[model samples]
Target chain A: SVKIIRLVKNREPLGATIKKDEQTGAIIVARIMRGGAADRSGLIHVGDELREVNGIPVEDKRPEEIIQILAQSQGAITFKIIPG
Target chain B: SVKIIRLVKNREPLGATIKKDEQTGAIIVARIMRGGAADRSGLIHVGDELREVNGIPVEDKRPEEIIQILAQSQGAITFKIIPG
Candidate 1:
């Protein structure tokens, strides 16, 4: 099942870092900053395969693009992730 | 005039960190990581005001968004800055 998260921004960062999995060539959640939005959510996990940011497809997208998309989004940001 | 820089991303970082100026309410170049893309550019400077990422207006964007933008960009990343 996909883990959908709607993290409220409210002037705080999502607090997660994403990495490209070279082995599988997929974008995956790499780090969860302590006490960050992603960490607080308790739903996001390291190694979670990310599919989209606010519904924008990320398969062919670059990591920089995803960051920009997240930056562009305000209020609450959504994440579509495939859990292992 | 805007300091337009096209820093190539060959699996490397832009190497610059941005900070919001509380007094001026603008985004300023905070740190230029040593030997990073921004540093190698020999153009990006600390305290330089950033205006956009690529063609996307960042006056209203956040730092995290900018970081992600850099991550998503391939080939090269463009920065529009107001030099001090």
Candidate 2:
């Protein structure tokens, strides 16, 4: 199965590194590598922030929730990134 | 990392399986098990379908794209499903 990855903000990096924010209650990644799906999607431009996993708003969530969400992906990543 | 998975349709089942179609260029699975990320995502219900992965547009792509997309998933999945 494939899931779309949505970043809270928008940025275009080389590779995307996922991490949980204990204070924010969401998953965040920075410096995504180029040529990857996140960058290829044309949504992740630069300085993009991870806001949510699906429609679930994680702007004020905990780190555990982000971890759980990241751990649930079973296949390819479809991402929703910002345009900034 | 987690990618939101989007199903072409809306359905609920126990578990989900993955398959590839060469002619139509898409991945498919039937008879899904509930309680999984795919199901918990609230997007996948019963008889859901897959249209694309990573914005590659697999509607007329290839089975390989589906496989590649699935393989690309590094961790938890975020899904996209339809309401109809």
Candidate 3:
């Protein structure tokens, strides 16, 4: 699993879109805004499988659920990613 | 731009999905199948902007158009990608 940290100072979007594979049920990165937090971090990439958020396992979770996880985070959120 | 080559001996899917950004019209790789041609090549990545297919520019082309380009290829297909 790949690990990444996003320091959230203000309540802002992660600057990326996440989608789930219909067949695999894998939560994948659909898009990354050009200069956003995730993009600037240079650690996230499209097709990367998102396994966890802030140490909470996210396997089989829906996109909206994952979004909620991010919404609940305040600062220093850690992400676990499966390299695609 | 990152360049990749997929040699198609018998017409088969390139083992990837292509999507267009509704806002920016940028062609992006949505997924790369595990152990597929593109995946095994290890040059193509999710989030890599597809700029051209076999030197033909695809900047403003739609997803269907790009698929057509790939479908029409016989052998030695080249892809130009903008790093994500």
Candidate 4:
């Protein structure tokens, strides 16, 4: 059981907050534990949810699909995120 | 083939950097793909070479040894590193 609170910017109302993606699904955040180049970049934050990596959605993605994306990364990366 | 250069400390230095662990051993750094807690803490960097985890020196450590250390972590972790 996990709860996530997403914050949206408040415009003219300085302190206003909006919430999106409050779907409390079983998504998880984990550390990028090893493999050199990606770790050295210091850009990819550890614990960033592995959601929609490359193009495949993370929910029970097939092993082949996961490996394919990882191999293709060749170090360069960008992610569609639900930040932890 | 990739190469690395290790730098040692400079005395009376302000902007100088120190380097250690030039062990050109083929250790690789990899990303932490999933798990819930460690990812969310945002302390573990994505590319940290999982060298001596817990107390097990990574050099030729077995898979079972890896699992034992990981299970013991219970989230809080400190690593002896040869930073990538």
Candidate 5:
């Protein structure tokens, strides 16, 4: 899986928006919030497909589950993204 | 401004995620949820830059403010997107 990482600050959100594909059930980037963690990194973008959260594969997980993973994550957030 | 439209059912979310640019504060698509209105519409994609939401310009807006615009929209949701 392709990868991207964002070093988020303490108690900060990733500052990126994401959703799942209807046909393939794959997670995709929807937006990057300004001045947020992801946006600060300057690596993440909208349309970057996600394959993993941290070291965990997220392909089969539901969107809510993925969101939960992100919500629970701390420190440097590792994301496996397919650059579109 | 480039544009996309998703005809959503009653009480449905756009089924897509979005974030804002840090330096420019431009809204960007993050993800497209599976089986959701945007996904079903087959037009929107992650990384697409949003210029207008239902004909309203979103440039220079904060992420929270953009979310409010989306939250308030219903029926045919028109989006102006710059294809990445």
Candidate 6:
């Protein structure tokens, strides 16, 4: 099932790493730092496919672009993801 | 009227300067960085009295602590302020 989640992000680190699936070209959560904001939220996990961020589709966005986009984001950001 | 505002902050920067009033010992918003998140939010100002952050009282907190607390804060942090 697809999941939509919202989290408040600050300039502080999201505490997660991401990678692109070479075959699928999908952005996936590579890792979640324990005790990081993402970890604290418990809404994100490793291997989950990130589909959208802040209402912007990530399918065409690079793993780094996703990171940069989220980095520059302010306020509450909504994400649509597929659980892996 | 007292205003309660919430802003998502990241490590990037809050884009404002603050100081402790020598007379009142209250922490005050000193300056807002142009085009910064604070400036973009248009919620904070130069003379607003910062009363509480994430429910932590700023009265007993130092100007530096106020900065540090927000710096370490994650998610949606709420601020209570007295409008200038």
Ordering by lDDT? 6, 1, 5, 3, 2, 4
**Candidate 1 local lDDT, residue A75:** 75
* Candidate 1: tens digits of C-alpha lDDT, residues B1-84: 787877775545567788888888788888989988888878889989889877777777656555655544545667888997
| Best by the lDDT measure | 6
Docking class of 3: incorrect
The sequence of per-residue lDDT tens digits that candidate 6 reaches over residues A5-40 is 988766566787888989989898999998877888
* CAPRI-style quality class for the chain A–B interface of candidate 6: incorrect
Separate DockQ for every predicted complex: 0.04, 0.02, 0.02, 0.02, 0.04, 0.08
Highest TM-score model number: 6
Residue A53 lDDT in model 3? 89
- Which tens-of-lDDT digit does each residue in A13-63 have in candidate 5? 566667677787778887766566677788888888988888789877777
- Candidates' interface RMSDs, in order? 10.6, 11.6, 16.8, 19.1, 11.3, 10.2
lDDT by residue for model 4 (B2-84), tens: 22222221121111111112365433333433322333334344444556654556668554445444433433344455445
Rank by TM-score, descending? Answer: 6, 1, 5, 3, 2, 4
Error of 1 at A19 (Å): 17
Reference-based lDDT, each prediction: 0.73, 0.46, 0.69, 0.37, 0.72, 0.76
User: Scoring only the second chain, what is candidate 4's TM-score?
Assistant: 0.44
lDDT of 6 at B80: 90
Residue-wise C-alpha lDDT for candidate 2, range A1-84, written one tens digit per residue? 223454332221223445444475445463344455555655554445566555555566665555445435534434544433
Candidate 4 error regions (>4 Å): A1-84, B1-27, B33-36
Query: Candidate 5's residue-wise lDDT over B1-84, tens digit each?
Result: 565664653456677789887786667889989988888878888888888876767765556547645643445667778877
TM values, all candidates: 0.51, 0.33, 0.46, 0.30, 0.49, 0.52
Worst 10 residues of 1 chain A by lDDT: A8-17
